């Protein structure tokens, strides 16, 4: 089985840590993470174990293993570099108009391939896009952990309202995708020019804000503007599907190269 | 779970065929490549796929499902470039000391990881060492010939003149009919060490195979290991004499391999 016995695992330097859990670089055949969680979170271990032993995908984090003692732990590959929101936003690192197709191309394709499988990501954002190797996407749930503020520019406006208390979907996951694909297009996060939160809340929410796609780059294909536009829209049943947005981006890669 | 419903897989550019396997390029998410079998290698194709389902290893091919109708499919990711042997012997691509350890490196987790999984490859060799986008090493089987005796017990070298290089000198005796082992897994992998160091293939001024077949089987034949190149480190060289010993019970285990081979890495950075 998937399960490793004690003291396999050489749990080496601490990443990062937030309440709840905390991941550390390790060794396991090689290089590994291992994300360390409290006794107390067994079922959203158990349930983070479930979803990630559902995939084998090229762009989705490689699950490899879980411990149970001495304590939880979930083994995955150890990615290297950073996140698309640390090239785009952080650093300055200027991609060239074919690796930023190349990026939404292999992102499309771990969404799709997610989506199929019956899982929504739920926290899709360019944060969560790993740079691997600074070529491969590899699409994870980075996070650790009002206290959302790192996600909203993703939000759907349905999701911000947390409409039925059950407002997440494969549409909300399509919305945050036109974001990421907003990102890649201009270089920036949508409403930068807005200073208040609680003010992208309200008008992304009521229908009264948008991204200004007039942002993008004079170089971004008229294929790309129109499909960041229908994934971005309000309506959610008006939003494409991922099989649909992928056929069209590898449709738009081999017509650039 | 790994089956994969009929229709979704687009099946594109036959890549390579042979005798019971065809390999294509094809569509399912993605890039993918998709191995057909005839209806009689039904078998083979469950072995096959229940060895490959055990395997979540970012050195090794990875698995990501299988269908039975119309036809029995094994699908994996594609790969981007070409193997080990093609760059080290097919071109000149000269690689520096840093890459050539660190290619051995990701070759020695892959079969690390292997052998804690209690699977033996069987058959490593450069050929089967993918270099994923000229970067990440993928162990893999990329052999579609199946030649042999399907009921010799005891069995041909004029069908296997691809791995006799990295055969150990039990498994050329083919002594008990029982001779592949992670001793025999270690051997070939001090073939592949001893290609990525010398550049070279070992036997390269012996022309007659059955002169290799019976020379290396009785103990007579052994790689030149002076034909090292002069930045090969003092470790590296120990190491891989310590892989190809005649007595497989001398030679190590890949704990051991890699932990000698990780410490060199870092001991070059
Ligand atoms: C160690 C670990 C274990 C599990 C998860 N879990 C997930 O990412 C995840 C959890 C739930 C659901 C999903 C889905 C399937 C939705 C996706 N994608 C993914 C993340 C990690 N984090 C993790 C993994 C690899 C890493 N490599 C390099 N660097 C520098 C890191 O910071 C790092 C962090
Ligand atoms: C399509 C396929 C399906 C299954 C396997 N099987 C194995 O690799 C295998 C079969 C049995 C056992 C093992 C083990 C686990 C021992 C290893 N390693 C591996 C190979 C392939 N071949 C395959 C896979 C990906 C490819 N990408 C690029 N190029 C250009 C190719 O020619 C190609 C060929």
Redesign the interface.
């Given at each position: 089985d998937?399960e490793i016995p004690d003291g396999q695992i050489t749990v080496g330097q601490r990443i990062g840590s937030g309440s709840f859990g905390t991941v550390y670089k390790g060794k396991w055949?090689?290089?590994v993470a291992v994300k360390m969680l409290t006794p107390q979170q067994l079922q959203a271990f158990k349930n983070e174990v479930g979803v990630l032993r559902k995939t084998?995908?090229?762009?989705i984090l490689?699950?490899?293993?879980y411990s149970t003692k001495p304590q939880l732990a979930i083994v995955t590959?150890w990615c290297e570099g950073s996140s698309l929101y640390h090239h785009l936003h952080a650093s300055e690192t200027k991609f060239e108009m074919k690796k930023l197709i190349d990026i939404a191309r292999?992102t499309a394709?771990g969404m799709?391939?997610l989506h199929?499988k019956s899982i929504i990501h739920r926290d899709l954002k360019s944060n969560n896009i790993f740079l691997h190797?600074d070529?491969?996407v590899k699409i994870g749930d980075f996070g650790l952990a009002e206290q959302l503020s790192g996600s909203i520019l993703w939000m759907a406006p349905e999701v911000i309202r947390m409409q039925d208390s059950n407002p997440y979907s494969f549409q909300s996951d399509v919305y945050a995708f036109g974001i990421v694909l907003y990102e890649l297009m201009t270089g920036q996060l949508p409403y930068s020019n807005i200073n208040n939160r609680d003010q992208i809340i309200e008008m992304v929410g009521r229908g009264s804000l948008s991204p200004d796609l007039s942002k993008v780059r004079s170089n971004c294909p008229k294929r790309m503007k129109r499909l960041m536009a229908e994934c971005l829209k309000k309506k959610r049943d008006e939003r494409p599907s991922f099989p649909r947005i992928?056929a069209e981006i590898e449709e738009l890669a081999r017509e650039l190269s």
């Open positions: 998937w055949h090689g290089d084998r995908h090229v762009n490689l699950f490899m293993g590959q292999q394709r799709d391939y199929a190797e070529n491969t992928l």
